[PDB]
Amino acid sequence: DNQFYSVEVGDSTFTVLKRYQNLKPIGSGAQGIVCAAYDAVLDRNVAIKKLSRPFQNQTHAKRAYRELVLMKCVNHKNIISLLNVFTPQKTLEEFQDVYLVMELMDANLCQVIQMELDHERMSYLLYQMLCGIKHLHSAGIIHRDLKPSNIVVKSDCTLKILDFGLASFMMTPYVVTRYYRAPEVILGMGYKENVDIWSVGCIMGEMVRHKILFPGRDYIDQWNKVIEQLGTPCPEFMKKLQPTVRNYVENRPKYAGLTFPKLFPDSLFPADSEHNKLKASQARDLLSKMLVIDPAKRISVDDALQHPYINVWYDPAEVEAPPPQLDEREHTIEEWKELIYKEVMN
Numbered sequence: 001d002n003q004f005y006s007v008e009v010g011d012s013t014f015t016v017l018k019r020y021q022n023l024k025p026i027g028s029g030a031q032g033i034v035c036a037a038y039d040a041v042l043d044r045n046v047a048i049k050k051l052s053r054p055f056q057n058q059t060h061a062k063r064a065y066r067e068l069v070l071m072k073c074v075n076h077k078n079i080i081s082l083l084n085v086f087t088p089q090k091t092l093e094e095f096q097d098v099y100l101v102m103e104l105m106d107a108n109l110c111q112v113i114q115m116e117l118d119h120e121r122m123s124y125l126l127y128q129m130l131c132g133i134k135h136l137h138s139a140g141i142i143h144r145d146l147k148p149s150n151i152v153v154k155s156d157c158t159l160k161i162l163d164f165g166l167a168s169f170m171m172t173p174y175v176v177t178r179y180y181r182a183p184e185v186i187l188g189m190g191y192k193e194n195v196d197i198w199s200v201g202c203i204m205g206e207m208v209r210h211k212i213l214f215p216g217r218d219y220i221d222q223w224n225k226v227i228e229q230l231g232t233p234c235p236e237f238m239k240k241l242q243p244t245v246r247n248y249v250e251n252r253p254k255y256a257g258l259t260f261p262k263l264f265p266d267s268l269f270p271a272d273s274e275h276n277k278l279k280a281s282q283a284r285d286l287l288s289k290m291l292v293i294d295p296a297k298r299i300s301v302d303d304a305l306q307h308p309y310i311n312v313w314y315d316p317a318e319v320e321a322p323p324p325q326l327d328e329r330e331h332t333i334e335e336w337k338e339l340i341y342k343e344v345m346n
C-alpha cells in the first residue's frame with residue numbers, strides 16, 4: 001500500500017517508487033551513489049542517483065539546486081535529460097534525500113579511454129562532446145570542469161555529459177579530479193567558451209596515450225606537467241596573469257616544449273592503411289590546436305567541429321537548438337533545504 005520501498009545497495013539505503021525494481025550498484029560519484037533499475041511504467045532500464053541531505057553544506061546545496069534548475073530547461077541528446085525526480089518524504093520538515101532518474105547508459109568514458117578505439121569511434125565521441133558543450137554554451141553555461149567520469153556512453157557509441165560545471169571546502173575522504181581543468185582555471189584567470197576545449201584535448205590525448213596528461217597532487221605539480229610537455233607560454237599570455245600568479249609562473253624554469261608528434265607519436269595511432277595514416281595526422285593536428293595554453297590562440301568550439309577529423313559526423317539537427325530567476329547563492333541549511341524542496345515538487 002505504501003508508494004515506496006527500502007533496499008540496501010551495498011551500504012547505501014535506496015527508498016524508491018515501486019515502479020523501480022531490481023536495483024544494482026553501477027557507480028559511486030562525488031555527489032551521490034548510482035543504481036541500475038528496471039522501470040515498470042516506461043518498460044525500460046534506468047539509472048537512479050541518490051543525493052543524501054544535499055542541503056547539508058553550501059557546496060552540496062548550490063550543486064544540487066543548480067543542477068535541478070539547469071536540467072529543467074536544457075534539451076539535447078549529448079546532455080543528460082531527467083526522466084524523473086522524487087523524494088520519499090511527505091513534508092519539508094521530514095525532507096532528507098532526493099532521487100534523480102535518467103536513461104541507463106552502458107559505461108563511463110573512463111572505461112572507454114582504456115580501450116584501443118579506432119578513428120571512427122574516437123572521432124564520433126569527440127564530435128558529441130563538442131555538440132554537448134556547444135549547446136551548454138548556447139544556453140549560457142560555460143562548464144569549466146568537464147572530465148571523463150561525468151561522461152557516459154552507450155554500446156552504440158552515443159555519449160551524454162552528466163554535470164554542468166563549476167559554481168570550495170569539502171570535509172570528506174573523496175577528493176575532486178582537477179587534471180582536465182584549463183590553465184585559466186588552474187591560475188584563477190578569467191574565462192570564455194573555449195575553456196572547455198582544453199578539457200576535450202586532455203580527454204583526446206588520454207584516449208591516445210592511455211595515461212592522464214597532466215597528473216598532480218595539487219595545481220603546483222599540475223602546472224609543472226603542462227609546461228614540461230607544451231612549453232612555457234609566450235610573453236603575450238604572461239601579460240594577462242594577475243601580479244602574484246604572474247611572478248609564480250614567470251619564476252618557473254623555462255621549457256621549449258615537446259612537439260606534438262614527440263608527445264603523440266605515430267606508434268600510438270592505428271597506422272595499418274593510408275586512411276589511418278591520414279586520420280592520425282588529422283587527430284594530431286586537432287590535439288595541437290586544442291592543447292594550447294593561451295585561450296586567445298586556442299581553437300573555437302565551432303572551428304573544432306568544422307575540423308576534418310570531426311566534421312565527418314555533421315547533421316543540421318545535431319549542432320544547434322532553440323534557446324529559452326537565474327540561480328541563487330549564500331543561504332542557510334534551512335533556506336537551501338526549502339529551495340531544493342521547491343524544485344523537487346515544482
Ligand SMILES: O=C(Nc1cnn(-c2csc(C(=O)NC3COC3)c2)c1)Nc1c(F)cccc1Cl
Pocket residue numbers: 026027034035036047048049080100101102103104105106107108152162163
Ligand atoms: O551516473 C549517472 N548516470 C548514469 C547513467 N548510466 N550510467 C552508467 C555508468 S556504467 C553503467 C552500466 O554499467 N550499465 C549496465 C549496462 O546495463 C547495466 C551505467 C550512469 N548519474 C545520474 C543518474 F544515475 C541519474 C540522474 C542523473 C545523474 Cl548525473
